[PDB]
Design a binder for this molecule. Structure first.
Ligand SMILES: *[C@@H]1O[C@H](CO)[C@@H](O[C@@H]2O[C@H](CO)[C@@H](O[C@@H]3O[C@H](CO)[C@@H](O)[C@H](O)[C@@H]3O)[C@H](O)[C@H]2NC(C)=O)[C@H](O)[C@H]1NC(C)=O
Ligand SMILES: *[C@@H]1O[C@H](CO)[C@@H](O[C@@H]2O[C@H](CO)[C@@H](O[C@@H]3O[C@H](CO)[C@@H](O)[C@H](O)[C@@H]3O)[C@H](O)[C@H]2NC(C)=O)[C@H](O)[C@H]1NC(C)=O
Ligand SMILES: *[C@@H]1O[C@H](CO)[C@@H](O[C@@H]2O[C@H](CO)[C@@H](O[C@@H]3O[C@H](CO)[C@@H](O)[C@H](O)[C@@H]3O)[C@H](O)[C@H]2NC(C)=O)[C@H](O)[C@H]1NC(C)=O
Ligand SMILES: *[C@@H]1O[C@H](CO)[C@@H](O[C@@H]2O[C@H](CO)[C@@H](O[C@@H]3O[C@H](CO)[C@@H](O)[C@H](O)[C@@H]3O)[C@H](O)[C@H]2NC(C)=O)[C@H](O)[C@H]1NC(C)=O
Ligand SMILES: *[C@@H]1O[C@H](CO)[C@@H](O[C@@H]2O[C@H](CO)[C@@H](O[C@@H]3O[C@H](CO)[C@@H](O)[C@H](O)[C@@H]3O)[C@H](O)[C@H]2NC(C)=O)[C@H](O)[C@H]1NC(C)=O
Ligand SMILES: *[C@@H]1O[C@H](CO)[C@@H](O[C@@H]2O[C@H](CO)[C@@H](O)[C@H](O)[C@H]2NC(C)=O)[C@H](O)[C@H]1NC(C)=O
Ligand SMILES: *[C@@H]1O[C@H](CO)[C@@H](O[C@@H]2O[C@H](CO)[C@@H](O)[C@H](O)[C@H]2NC(C)=O)[C@H](O)[C@H]1NC(C)=O
Ligand SMILES: *[C@@H]1O[C@H](CO)[C@@H](O[C@@H]2O[C@H](CO)[C@@H](O)[C@H](O)[C@H]2NC(C)=O)[C@H](O)[C@H]1NC(C)=O
Ligand SMILES: *[C@@H]1O[C@H](CO)[C@@H](O)[C@H](O)[C@H]1NC(C)=O
Lengths: 49, 49, 49, 276, 97
């Protein structure tokens, strides 16, 4: 097994303040305003109004 | 002298606010970033820092 | 290779691909479905075990 | 033989307040003479609680959703209510657990049960003897069984208002079903009594099943074999929500008081500076 | 190749749909090769795994159902296109890698 071939793929990610190109399969919801909610915008999560 | 007292208090409060942007050896100064990137165990390491 | 404008759903690989090695460094693997990435590169090659 | 009743009034589902009930021990750490601020799934104080009654011409056995754990309270003069079924589909397709009390001993059994539409025990009031009845038609792929020691259960009818309050908390976490219990002597005719009671841990069962629904198991009292009848009994269901409580342990490790931090400004004050 | 998925904080077919360990796990994982005992020259198809599921399992939870799976709604009475058997045999062979 030490001499057998192995295919390698290295995935390199960038997380900048820029539009998202690749995304997870998480499903979206409607906006809720003026309420204390948990939010998730392009994978950036938080709690607030 | 009265102005000096005012300035000292205002400057101390501003420094307290600015310290939040300061990293302390964690991967990020934003709590939500390490919360959204890392699973709870290593997240607890960074958050404790 | 640059990967853009897509949904990264690894579950499609579950019935065809093994992945002897799967190691993530900047992020957690349980977090991948909840994240959106600004940029993704894929480097591919072959090495022995 | 799944037997169905045809003269049952649909449940009223009247709402009552749970004054200070539903407190339990959230962990297994022994604590003595301390105040403990803990954030967990508790029943908020003075929250609405649904009532299910089988006093007369009703055998109230709906499938009630679990919704992240429940508080259950039975006003039981005649031991009518004994046992539950917890499951997801309440079918032979999925695993479900029956926690029942027959006459002799308590039985906890997890299998693929062919659950009847109306599972129930039959107790002839005249002879005060149970007739064997089938909660399930068949059972297969059983993964857990526990049977307790034998005892005696009083099957006789009891007059007057309910004298017993049996309280339970059911929580499903990490493949473990935590069952907490408590008992209180009451004299209440129609409502949930107002008080405080902390339920001690009784069971931590390693069932490992997805529990989304449950159904209470009740005994029917037919005065004649070619009919069905019910003795008076009622139970109450509330839902646990994630909230911060301040529990107060005495020297024996017993919770003797609690504060719900979100109830009102005075409670928030007591939680903010930890004191009663 | 699946043994690595038996650990806290892992994703894979086994961790998502078969056996999940808590993030705070107190214990030890022990694993040993059983080629001779559990494989055959014809092949051993007794051992199965759930390859598809609608949601991820919670820690220490097990799923014993054998319902035909459809990706979205679409109740299917038998196995066919867009209707799969959720369980998949491992197919252990003595000469496998
Ligand atoms: C899970 O529970 C259901 C509910 O009873 C079972 O379905 C029942 O299966 C029996 C046996 O196959 C059926 O009886 C058969 O009825 C047909 C007429 O349709 C007759 O030709 C056969 O000789 C036999 O009497 C019964 O109808 C059926 N009931 C329903 C409501 O579907 C099911 O079999 C159980 N699954 C397992 C694995 O035990
Ligand atoms: C309440 O439920 C329990 C558990 O289902 C019942 O216990 C069971 O009682 C029967 C009858 O006494 C036992 O059957 C006997 O088993 C022995 C083997 O130890 C055998 O030699 C006898 O010939 C007979 O088959 C059964 O083993 C026992 N189960 C357990 C787990 O102890 C109990 O009878 C029920 N009480 C009621 C319905 O009032
Ligand atoms: C959960 O319960 C089901 C139904 O009781 C179990 O499925 C049954 O598994 C047995 C084997 O343990 C099957 O019998 C075998 O059938 C094959 C093919 O005909 C035959 O070659 C074998 O000699 C043996 O007789 C049975 O057919 C099967 N029934 C169904 C409806 O699938 C299942 O194994 C249980 N899950 C467990 C125990 O984890
Ligand atoms: C923590 O638990 C211990 C042990 O149960 C409690 O100490 C015990 O207190 C009872 C009080 O009911 C004592 O029993 C009886 O007290 C009555 C009161 O007059 C007396 O008439 C009886 O003859 C009998 O003594 C019991 O002796 C005592 N046990 C000891 C001291 O070992 C303690 O009160 C509990 N802490 C609380 C409730 O805060
Ligand atoms: C425990 O069992 C319950 C019931 O079997 C599971 O709840 C079910 O979860 C699935 C998957 O999240 C839900 O399907 C979804 O339905 C929505 C529409 O409501 C659809 O947009 C999605 O694409 C997906 O098909 C299903 O509605 C839901 N059923 C109920 C009654 O809530 C639960 O996931 C199980 N828990 C575990 C840990 O397996
Ligand atoms: C393995 O999984 C893939 C993806 O889940 C399956 O490919 C799908 O096949 C169905 C037909 O059965 C198509 O309708 C889908 O469009 C396919 N999806 C993709 C992404 O290719 C494949 O069928 C599965 N293989 C087996 C043997 O079950
Ligand atoms: C990798 O891609 C090749 C080429 O598409 C696949 O080989 C095909 O397999 C299907 C069966 O699903 C056959 O119907 C085709 O005739 C095959 N084509 C060729 C050119 O061989 C192969 O199955 C793929 N492997 C995986 C794991 O997806
Ligand atoms: C408890 O449940 C009742 C429902 O019976 C809630 O609604 C009240 O209903 C009565 C009549 O049924 C009205 O007179 C009240 O005005 C209703 N209150 C409302 C709408 O706020 C009641 O609100 C619930 N209380 C709590 C604390 O949950
Ligand atoms: C007494 O109990 C037995 C036990 O089954 C029952 O058959 C009988 O009917 C009961 N007595 C009367 C009067 O019903």
């Amino acid at each position: 097994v030490g001499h057998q071939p192995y295919r390698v793929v290295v995935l390199s990610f960038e997380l900048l303040n820029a539009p998202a190109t690749v995304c997870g399969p998480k499903l979206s919801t409607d906006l809720i305003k003026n309420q204390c909610v948990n939010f998730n915008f392009n994978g950036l999560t938080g709690t607030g109004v | 002298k009265l102005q000096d007292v005012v300035n000292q208090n205002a400057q101390a409060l501003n420094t307290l606010v600015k310290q939040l942007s300061s990293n302390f050896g964690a991967i990020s100064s934003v709590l939500n970033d390490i919360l959204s990137r890392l699973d709870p165990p290593e997240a607890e390491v960074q958050i404790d820092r | 290779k640059r990967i853009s404008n897509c949904v990264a759903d690894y579950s499609v690989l579950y019935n065809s691909t093994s992945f002897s090695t799967f190691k993530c460094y900047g992020v957690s693997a349980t977090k991948l479905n909840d994240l959106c990435f600004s940029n993704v590169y894929a480097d591919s090659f072959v090495v022995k075990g | 033989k799944c037997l169905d009743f045809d003269d049952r009034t649909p449940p009223a589902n009247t709402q009552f307040l749970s004054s200070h009930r539903g407190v339990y021990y959230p962990d297994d750490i022994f604590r003595s003479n301390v105040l403990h601020l803990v954030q967990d799934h508790f029943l908020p104080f003075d929250s609405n609680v649904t009532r299910f009654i089988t006093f007369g011409l009703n055998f109230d056995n709906p499938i009630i959703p679990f919704r992240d754990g429940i508080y259950f309270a039975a006003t039981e003069k005649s031991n009518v209510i004994r046992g539950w079924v917890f499951g997801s589909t309440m079918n032979n397709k999925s695993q479900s657990v029956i926690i029942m009390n027959n006459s002799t001993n308590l039985v906890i059994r997890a299998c693929n049960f062919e659950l009847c539409d109306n599972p129930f025990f039959v107790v002839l009031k005249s002879n005060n003897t149970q007739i064997p009845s089938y909660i399930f038609n068949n059972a297969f792929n059983c993964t857990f069984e526990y049977v307790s020691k034998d005892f005696n259960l009083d099957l006789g009818e009891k007059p007057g208002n309910f004298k017993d309050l049996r309280e339970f908390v059911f929580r499903n976490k990490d493949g473990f079903l935590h069952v907490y219990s408590g008992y209180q002597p009451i004299s209440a005719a129609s409502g949930l009594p107002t008080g405080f009671n902390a339920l001690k841990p009784i069971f931590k069962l390693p069932l490992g099943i997805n529990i989304t629904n449950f159904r209470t198991l009740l005994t029917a009292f037919p005065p004649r074999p070619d009919y069905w009848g019910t003795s008076a009994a009622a139970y109450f269901v509330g839902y646990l929500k994630p909230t911060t409580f301040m529990l107060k342990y005495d020297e024996n490790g017993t919770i003797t008081d609690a504060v719900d931090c979100s109830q009102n400004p005075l409670a928030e004050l007591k939680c903010s500076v930890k004191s009663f | 190749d699946d043994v690595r998925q038996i650990a806290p904080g892992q994703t894979g077919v086994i961790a998502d749909y078969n056996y999940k360990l808590p993030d705070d796990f107190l214990g030890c994982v022990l694993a040993w090769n059983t080629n001779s005992k559990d494989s055959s020259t014809s092949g051993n198809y007794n051992y199965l795994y759930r390859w598809v599921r609608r949601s991820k399992l919670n820690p220490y939870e097990r799923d014993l159902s054998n319902d035909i799976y459809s990706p979205g709604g679409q109740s299917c009475s038998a196995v066919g296109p867009n209707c799969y058997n959720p369980l998949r045999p491992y197919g252990f062979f003595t000469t496998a890698g």
